[PDB]
Specification:
Distance between the termini: 25 Å
Strand content: 25-35%
Protein name: Ficolin-1
Main location: secreted
Radius of gyration: 16 Å
CATH superfamily of the largest domain: Gamma Fibrinogen, chain A, domain 1
Subcellular location: Secreted; Cell membrane
GO molecular function, one term: carbohydrate derivative binding
Helix content: 10-25%
Membrane topology: Peripheral membrane protein
CATH class of the largest domain: Alpha Beta
Bound molecules: calcium ion
């Protein structure tokens, strides 16, 4: 139950769940949520809130969809902004981003803290110091930005970033990263509308795999 139940995937790792997979955790108000734990990468104990792997799922979705979450436990998903807020409210959570290109290269980025605010603050990103990684830093430029979707423009651009670059993100004017963008399968001619991490493969290359995950700092 909530009194004794795990709050995150690090609690589950500590209790001897050593294989990655879906487990029930208890959010701060006791709401149970089934989450994907990555128990393998970089020490394990990561709660995964975004996964892309094959383009099977449409990510060009509205505020409501991003708010509640969408996709499949068996594949690609967005866990949901209300859930991500709840998961990152208590304590301090480090962010890890894992990327794989179509050539087989694995790259990563790590930040020392990560929080998304509530819906009243439009799921604003509060991001701590970049730690390092082969992917470089394409998220600090998004610190302190509201989340935006095609139907709800909260960016700091005169344009509608989510529509122009075909994703959903804490867009600024407009982005350095776009991991909820179109699944464009490597090199693309269109500018900056793919699963892009510009510090690594740039604005014209869309990754094969994206995983975003958190663990207590
Ligand atoms: Ca705008």
């Amino acid at each position: 139950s909530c009194a004794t139940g795990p709050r995150n995937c690090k609690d589950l790792l500590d209790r001897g769940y050593f294989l990655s997979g879906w487990h029930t955790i208890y959010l701060p108000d006791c709401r149970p949520l089934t989450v994907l734990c990555d128990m393998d990468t970089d020490g394990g104990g990561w709660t995964v809130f975004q996964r892309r792997m094959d383009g099977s799922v449409d990510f060009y979705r509205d505020w409501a969809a991003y708010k509640q979450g969408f996709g499949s436990q068996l594949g690609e998903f967005w866990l949901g902004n209300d859930n991500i807020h709840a998961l990152t409210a208590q304590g301090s959570s480090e962010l890890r981003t894992d990327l794989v290109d179509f050539e087989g290269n694995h790259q990563f980025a790590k930040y020392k803290s990560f929080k998304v605010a509530d819906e009243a603050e439009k799921y604003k990103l509060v991001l701590g110091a970049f730690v390092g990684g082969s992917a470089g830093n394409s998220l600090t430029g998004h610190n302190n930005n509201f989340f935006s979707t095609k139907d709800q423009d909260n960016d700091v651009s005169s344009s509608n970033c989510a529509e122009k670059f075909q994703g959903a993100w804490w867009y600024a004017d407009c982005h350095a990263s776009n991991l909820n963008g179109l699944y464009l399968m490597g090199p693309h001619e269109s500018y900056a509308n793919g699963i892009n991490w510009s510090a690594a493969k740039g604005y014209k290359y869309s990754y094969k795999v994206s995983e975003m995950k958190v663990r207590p700092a």
